[PDB]
Amino acid sequence: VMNRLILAMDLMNRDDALRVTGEVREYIDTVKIGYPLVLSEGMDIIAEFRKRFGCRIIADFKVADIPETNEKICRATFKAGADAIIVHGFPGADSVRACLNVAEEMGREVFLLTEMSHPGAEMFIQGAADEIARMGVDLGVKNYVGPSTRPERLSRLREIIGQDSFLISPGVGAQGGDPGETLRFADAIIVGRSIYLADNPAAAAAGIIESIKDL
Amino acid sequence: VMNRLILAMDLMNRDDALRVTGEVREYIDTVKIGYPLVLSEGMDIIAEFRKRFGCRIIADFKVADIPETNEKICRATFKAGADAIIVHGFPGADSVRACLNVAEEMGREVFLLTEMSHPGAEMFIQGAADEIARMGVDLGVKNYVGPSTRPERLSRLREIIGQDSFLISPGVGAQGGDPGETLRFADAIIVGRSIYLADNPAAAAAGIIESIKDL
Ligand SMILES: COC(=O)c1cc(=O)[nH]c(=O)n1[C@@H]1O[C@H](COP(=O)(O)O)[C@@H](O)[C@H]1O
Numbered sequence A, B: 001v002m003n004r005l006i007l008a009m010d011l012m013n014r015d016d017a018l019r020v021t022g023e024v025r026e027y028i029d030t031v032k033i034g035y036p037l038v039l040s041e042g043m044d045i046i047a048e049f050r051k052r053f054g055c056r057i058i059a060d061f062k063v064a065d066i067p068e069t070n071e072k073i074c075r076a077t078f079k080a081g082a083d084a085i086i087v088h089g090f091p092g093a094d095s096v097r098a099c100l101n102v103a104e105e106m107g108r109e110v111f112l113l114t115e116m117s118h119p120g121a122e123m124f125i126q127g128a129a130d131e132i133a134r135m136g137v138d139l140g141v142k143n144y145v146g147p148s149t150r151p152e153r154l155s156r157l158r159e160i161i162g163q164d165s166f167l168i169s170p171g172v173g174a175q176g177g178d179p180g181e182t183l184r185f186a187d188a189i190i191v192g193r194s195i196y197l198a199d200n201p202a203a204a205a206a207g208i209i210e211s212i213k214d215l
């Protein structure tokens, strides 16, 4: 990932999402697109971004259904041109395996979300997160998401998944996480509002990248 | 809900989804629309169904993000005309409260998904499900989803949420659940494939309704 920085593009307007992504494109190679943008502007936005920016697109869809429905969601998402999809591990191994099977069929990747970054993640997800990560390892998952807001948890996650797995991490900036600390454990950080709500997104992205290079 | 039967419309083609929904409309008053259809045909499909069929629409989006992103997903979903949205409880109370706040602002409803119907739900969700349900009660949630495939769990869920809360239940038919047993505890059943993959969906829906009336 260019500069170890992934843009979380959660603006809900195509014109604003295009403007900001264009302004910061020199500093990233990967955009995370989620439901705020796709449910406002349509799934065609994924191929439009891929074409316009030549970026990789991670569809942050948090897939969290039964296996049969997960299959359908993943097929529709890769048909729309996404490079990878983020999947919840909490629904269990059959639900994750269904997403892995569609990614294998379509030559795509699954990222497993293990422990979330917000305060409520402490209630139920955190207590299951090490097990969810070990389930990922046992299913052959190679890409994971874990929380910038809890670097001790992100260290434990890294310990479970090993040094060869790819780990990306949201919660940097607005939610309180720090780029440099997070990159002690994660390969890349996800940043949304700190960039896309900034008066100058390119300057916000450049400032983050300057602090990453120093690491 | 008319006849206590909610159609899970997970066909991925607008023409097929419209045909089947029209054929069974005399037997339901509520259609559950999820991501298989919306990610294939666009969010405009929700208002189209509401207009064409005069049904209520439950958006089965399994919302399962941090509070700020959940807000955005719910706003986009109610803007598209959905009557209600299904929300995961596993991400914790702040994530659920964010959805409740948007539903209160827009005069809509939240359904809390407590325990899922597929086999993998046993790994992590089932052990947290009673607590997730009690969290719902303490947040003021009045509408819940629980599993037809485990009627003893559906009885425990009902015990926690009380007799005044509304409880709907998927997993009937294809996943092995029974209409009559499920309706001992749930107010309505959700049925997808048993109807929409049938050679004659209207006959499939009518057969289910005949067995419901007998209860
Ligand atoms: C895999 O899903 C995520 O990206 C996600 C998981 C998580 O635990 N925390 C989290 O913040 N996210 C998402 O990452 C983005 C964070 O954006 P932010 O920098 O806080 O504006 C946003 O799109 C969230 O929906």
Ligand SMILES: COC(=O)c1cc(=O)[nH]c(=O)n1[C@@H]1O[C@H](COP(=O)(O)O)[C@@H](O)[C@H]1O
Pocket: A065, A066, A069, B008, B010, B034, B060, B062, B086, B113, B115, B116, B117, B118, B145, B147, B170, B171, B172, B173, B174, B175, B190, B191, B192, B193, B194
């Ligand atoms: C609230 O979300 C659901 O509807 C859901 C939760 C769950 O635990 N199990 C479950 O089957 N569902 C959904 O309900 C539908 C079941 O359809 P089916 O009758 O099995 O074809 C389908 O849309 C599933 O995604």
